[PDB]
Amino acid sequence: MGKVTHSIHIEKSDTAADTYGFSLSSVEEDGIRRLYVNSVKETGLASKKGLKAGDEILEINNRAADALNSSMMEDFFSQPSVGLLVRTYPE
Amino acid sequence: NQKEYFF
Structure with missing residues (x-):
């Protein structure tokens, strides 16, 4: 626990x-x-929303990470908005 | 299959 x-x-x-x-870094286990979130620009919008290095992206637009692909992702992040499910440590 | 993305 803790997450x-x-x-x-x-x-x-x-x-x-x-x-x-x-x-983001992508890896198959x-x-x-x-x-996983590799880096976050300190002055960027993602940082403003509370995203941190070391966070894990569980879902994007209600789709599980393992069910996403690169063209799908480039599409979603070029749209006016995007939703994420993130697993993180508090603080 | 380690890829990286910038968004």
Whole structure:
């Protein structure tokens, strides 16, 4: 335990920027792909919404991480908004 | 199959 799960909705209409300011690493463990937050721009929108390095992305737009692919993801993050299910440590 | 994405 120690980990908490919460939903995040981020919208591009808040910033002059067209990007959210974070990076993800993708890795396959025992046939299943997991997504982790690699870095978060301190001044970016993702940081503003509480995303942190080391967080795990469980879902994007209600789709499990292992069921996403790259073209699907590039599409979702170029849209005006996107929803995330994130597993994180408090603080 | 370690990929990385920037968003």
